[PDB]
Design a protein around this ligand. Structure first.
Ligand SMILES: Nc1ccc(S(=O)(=O)NC(=O)NCCSSCCNC(=O)NS(=O)(=O)c2ccc(N)cc2)cc1
Ligand SMILES: Nc1ccc(S(=O)(=O)NC(=O)NCCSSCCNC(=O)NS(=O)(=O)c2ccc(N)cc2)cc1
Lengths: 317, 319, 317, 317
C-alpha cells in the first residue's frame, strides 16, 4: 500500500485519539517545505532574469506563515529571528516549534544541499505563551525532523513510533513514504567534520580522528565526507552510518551549531533511529537551554561510533 | 536582455560562421540533462510506490545522453563511463563530433541524496578514416567544448568554450537554461581545500605536507576550511564558485589516481582553465596527457592558481 | 489567510466533531486528482516518444487505489467497472464512493478539458457490503464535486457548508482555496446542449431552445457554449450562470448521462450553490437508483433558467 | 527517433541553408509559450493567496520581450497593443510577427482552454519599419501556428513543409513531436459555431446549419461543439475534421475574429493541412488588410465541408 506524509501522520493521530492539532501542524509545514523546495530548485528564476521584460528570508516567511495559519502553534523560534514569535491570540494552538528554515544557505551560491530543520514541543504553561516555552530540553520533543533539498527533496520525520522518510514527488507535490521505521547502522565507515580547524581541536577529538585514519586494530580506515551543510551530512550519517562531529574546542566551548533548531531535532531523529547524539559531557537531548539561540557541541551517528568517541573523551577526562 | 542556453550557443555559432552541428549537439545534450534532472528529483516516484496499484538512474541517464546525442546527427564516436567500448554512431546519424561523458557522476552515493552531475567533453574528429575508439584518444587541449550539469540544490549547467565559462540555471517551471553568470573567473587564491582525508595513511608525502600547511600554516595565518562532498561535480563547482583547491592525487597504491581522464578530469580541467584556474596531475597539465585508453585514470589537482602552485611547490620538494 | 483543501476539510471535521474518516477519503482523492492532472498534462510523454531510446484506465487505477488505501471506503462505483468494487475487509471504512475518474476522455485527442466527478455516501446498514450500498438517491450524499483539468486544474467541493473551489498550484502540489461558498447567478445568458441532434429533440427542448435564440420580448438572445465535456460545461455554468441540458428524447427516454457518478454529484454541487437540477419530471437528487450504471436526464444550472425550462417542459407534458 | 521543436526547426533551416534568424525567432516564441503555459496552469498561485504571508498582460509581455530579444523581428502586432510595436534598431531582424498572446482569455474565469496564436512574415518593404509591414495578405506568411493550453499544452506549427504538432512535456520543459505532417479529414461530422446568434444569421449560414441537423440525404446529423475559444475549436476541427464558423452578425458586421493574428494563422494552418478557410467571398489568406486590428468573418475546416457551405453561399448569391 502506497502511503503519504499527511495520511501516515493522520493515521498515527487517530490511534493516539488526538484532536488533529499535530496533523494540522505537520500538514502546514509539509506545505511550506514544498514551497521552499520549489524556490530552492529555482522555479521562476527566468522572471528574475527578465523573461517578461532573499531565499532564507522567503523560507522563514513560508514556515512562519504556514505554522501561524495552522491554528496549532503559539510560540515560534527560528534562526532568522532574534526573539521568539508569539502567534496572535486568535491563531494560537498548543505547540511550540523551533526551526531553521534554510540551513546551509550561507553556501547556497555553490548549490550545496540545503535543508529545513524543525522540533515540536507542547507548550508548558496554561499561563499565556512566551519565549520561555521554547526553553525546553530535547527530551520533551513531541516530533522533529528535517527536509533535505539535495539531489531530491526528502522529509525525514521522527515521532514516538520511529523515524520515517518521505520523498517529495514534484510531479504531484506529494510526500511518498519510501523508508519505514528507519534504524541507523550500529557502526559505519565514514566520519564527518571540518578538519580544516585541526589546530583548534580538543585533544580527545584529535585522538579520535587519528583512530579513524590510522586504526590501532589494523581494520580499514574510515572515509571522510563533509558537505558543510548539516542536514546533508546528518542525512548521510542516518542512511549510511558513521559519525558527524561539530565539537567544542577552547575557542568555542559550546560548539557553533544551534541547540533548539539544529542539535535537538537531529539528536531526536538519531535517538529514534537507534543512534546517539552527545555534547561530549551529556546527551544533547538532556541539555536545558537558557537562551533560544545558544550553541551546543554535537557528536552524533552510529552507536558504536559515538560510544567509541565517548570512551576517548572520558580518557582525556 | 534575458539569455538562454540555446540562444547563447546559437549566437556564438553565427559569430564563428558554423554549419549548426555543435548547436544541435548542445541542444540535444541539454534536453537530456533536463530529463536527467527530472528523474534525479524523483518526478513520478509515487508510481514506483503503488499510487496506481524501473530503470536505475545511471542506466537511465546513460540511455538519455546516448540517445539524445545519437539523434542529434552531430556525433560519430561516443565514450561513456558506463560502456567499456566507444559507441560508434550508425552511418545515417553521423556528424563530426566525439563526445566523452559521465552521465551521472557521484550516483554511487545518490541513496543519501548527495549532489550528482553530468560531465561532458566534446572533440572534433581529426582523422579522415572510418570512425573508431581512437578518435576519443585526444589530449584535453583539443576540446572544442566541455562542461557539466550539477543536480544540487538547483540544477545548473556550466559550459566552457573559447569565449570562456558561462553558468546557466535550469528553471524547472519552464524547462529553460537561463544565463545567470557570464564569463566566470575563479579566485586567484582560495581558503578551502578538498580531498578524502580518511585515506591519509596512503597519501603521497607531498600531499601529507601540503595538507599540513593548510591546517597549520607556517606563516601563522588562519587555516583553510575543509569541504568534501565526495561528488566530483559538487566539489569542483564549489571550487570554481568560492575558489580554493580540489585534489584527487596519485599515491603508492593508485599511481594514476582514480578519476577518469576523458570524461571527468579533462572536461573539468578545460572548465578550470577557461575560468583562469589551474589543473595538474602533479607532473603534467591534465589537458596535455595523451590517453592510450578511453577509460584511463588521471591524478587531478585543480582550482585557484595560487593554491595549485602551492601544491606544486610542495610536490617539487618531494620530486 | 491562505487555505488548502486539507486544512479546510479538517476544520469542517473538527467543527462536526468527526473521527477523520471523511478527511482521509478526501485527502486520498486529492492525491489521486494531482496524479491524474500530471498525467493529463502529459508529464513524462517524452519517454513514450523515445527520449531514452490508457489515460482513463490509469485515472481509474489512481482513484480506486487511493480510495481503497484510505481505509475510509467499503463500496466503490466507477464508470470504468461493470460491477461495484467491494473493498477488502481489512481496508474497509464507512463510505461509498461513486466516480467517473476521467469524464470526457472520449475526445481527449483534441485536448478538450476533461475531469473527475465523485459523490460520497455513508453506507446505511451493517450488512455485508454489496452493490446495493451505492443505490442511494443523491439526497443522501455527504460530499460531492469534481476536478476540472482545464486551462488550470481546479477542485470544486460541495458539502453541507456549501461549495468551495480550490486551484491546484502545480509548483507545490497543493489545492489552494480561491472561491469561498460559491453561489450560482439566479439567471444566466448561456444555454448549453448538443444542438446537432435537434431532429431527435423533445418538442419541449425544441421550444425552450427556440426561446433562448428568439426571445418573445426585447431581451438579447442567449449565447451558446458546448464543450461536449460535462465537467467543463457544468463548471462554466456554475461560474457564469445559465443552463446545461442533456435531456430525454424518444430514442433515449432516460437521457445519456449516468445518474450515480455524473448527474447526482453535479446536481448536488448545483443545489449547494443555489442552483437546480431536474430530469424534467423530478429533482435529479430524488431519483432512487435500481442500477449503478442507470442513466438520467439532467437539466441544470441557474434556477430562473431551470424553472423556465420546466414551464416549457410541462406545456408538453 | 525522438524529435523536439528546436531540433526539428533547426534541421528544416539547414536544408534551406538559412541564416538561423527564423530558428532564433521560433525558439524565443517557444520559450514564451512555456512561461505562458506555466502561468496559465497557475504555478505560483499559492504566493498570490498569501502562503508566504494579470494573465493576458503577462502573456503579452512574455511574447513581446522574447521576440524583441531574438534579434529576429522588426515589427510586432499584438491583440493587446493598439499600435504596431517597432523594434528598437539594435534588436531589429527581418521578420514581422502578428500574435494573440492569450486567445479566449476573456472567459478564462471558467478555466476554458486558452491559446497563443502567431503569424510570421518576412518584412516585404524596404522602407523604415512601420505598421504597414504587418499589413500583408496571409498568403505571404512564412510560418504560423498556435499553442493550445488545453488538457495538455500542444504547439501546432505550420511551415512550407507541412503542419507539425509538438506536445509540451512539463516534466522537462520540452516540446516533443507527436504528430507529423498533419492532414485534416476530407469530410468531418461536427459543426462549430455560436448558434445563439441564429437571429442574426444571413440565409446562407441558416440553410447550411439546417442541413447539418436535418441531412437532405438521410445521412447522420452532425454533432455540435463550441468551446467559445478559437484555438480549442480550431484544433478539434484539425484533429477530428468538420467545420468551424464565426460569420458576421448585427453586432459584428465585418466578423468578430481578428484577421492578422487570429484568422490568417488558422487559415494558414488549415491550408497546409489540406483544409480550407474562407470569408464566404474569398480565401482568408487572400484578404489584403488595411488596419492591424481589422475583423474578418471566417469559415474553416475539412475541404468537403467548406466546399458544401460555399455551394450554399453561392445559391444565396
Ligand atoms: N523552415 C526554416 C526554418 C528556419 C530557417 S532559418 O532561416 O532560420 N535558417 C536556419 O534555421 N538555418 C539552420 C540553423 S543554422 S545556426 C547558425 C549558427 N551556427 C552554428 O551554431 N554553428 S555551430 O557549428 O553549431 C557552432 C556553434 C557554437 C560555436 N561556438 C561555434 C559553432 C529557414 C527555414
Ligand atoms: N465536513 C466534515 C469533514 C470531515 C469529517 S471527519 O469525519 O472526517 N472528521 C474530521 O475530519 N475530523 C477532524 C478531527 S480528526 S483528524 C486527526 C486525528 N487526530 C490527530 O491526528 N491528532 S493529533 O493530535 O494531531 C496527533 C497527530 C500525530 C500523532 N502521532 C498523534 C496525535 C466530518 C465532517
Amino acid at each position: 500500500d502506497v502511503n503519504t506524509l499527511t495520511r501516515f501522520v493522520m493515521e498515527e493521530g487517530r490511534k493516539a485519539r488526538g484532536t488533529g492539532e499535530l496533523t494540522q501542524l505537520l500538514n502546514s509545514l509539509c506545505t511550506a517545505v514544498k514551497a521552499i523546495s520549489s524556490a530552492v530548485r529555482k522555479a521562476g528564476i527566468a522572471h528574475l532574469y527578465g523573461i517578461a521584460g532573499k531565499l532564507d528570508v522567503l523560507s522563514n516567511d513560508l514556515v512562519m506563515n504556514m505554522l501561524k495559519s495552522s491554528f496549532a502553534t503559539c510560540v515560534l523560534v527560528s534562526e532568522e529571528d532574534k526573539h521568539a514569535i508569539i502567534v496572535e491570540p486568535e491563531k494560537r494552538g498548543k505547540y511550540v516549534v523551533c526551526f531553521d528554515p534554510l540551513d546551509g544557505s550561507s553556501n547556497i551560491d555553490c548549490l550545496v544541499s540545503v535543508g529545513t530543520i524543525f522540533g515540536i514541543y507542547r507548550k508548558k504553561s496554561t499561563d499565556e505563551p512566551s519565549e520561555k516555552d521554547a526553553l525546553q530540553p530535547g527530551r520533551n520533543l513531541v516530533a522533529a525532523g528535517y527536509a533535505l533539498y539535495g539531489s531530491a527533496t526528502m522529509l525525514v520525520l521522527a515521532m514516538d513510533c520511529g523515524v520515517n522518510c518521505f520523498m517529495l514527488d514534484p510531479a504531484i507535490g506529494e510526500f511518498i513514504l519510501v523508508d519505514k521505521d528507519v534504524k541507523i547502522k550500529k557502526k559505519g565507515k565514514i566520519y564527518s567534520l571540518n578538519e580544516g580547524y585541526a589546530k583548534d581541536f580538543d585533544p580527545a577529538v584529535t585522538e579520535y580522528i587519528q583512530r579513524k585514519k590510522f586504526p590501532p586494530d589494523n581494520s580499514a580506515p574510515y572515509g571522510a565526507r563533509y558537505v558543510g551543510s548539516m542536514v546533508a551530512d546528518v542525512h548521510r550519517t542516518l542512511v549510511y552510518g558513521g559519525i558527524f562531529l561539530y565539537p567544542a574546542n577552547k575557542k568555542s566551548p559550546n560548539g557553533k551549531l544551534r541547540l533548539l533548531y539544529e542539535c535537538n531535532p537531529m539528536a531526536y531523529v538519531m535517538e529514534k533511529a537507534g543512534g546517539m547524539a552527545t555534547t561530549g559531557k551529556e546527551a544533547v537531548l538532556d541539555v536545558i537551554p537558557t537562551d533560544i539561540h545558544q550553541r551546543a557541541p554535537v557528536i552524533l551517528g552510529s552507536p558504536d561510533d559515538v560510544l567509541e568517541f565517548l570512551k576517548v573523551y572520558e580518557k582525556h577526562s
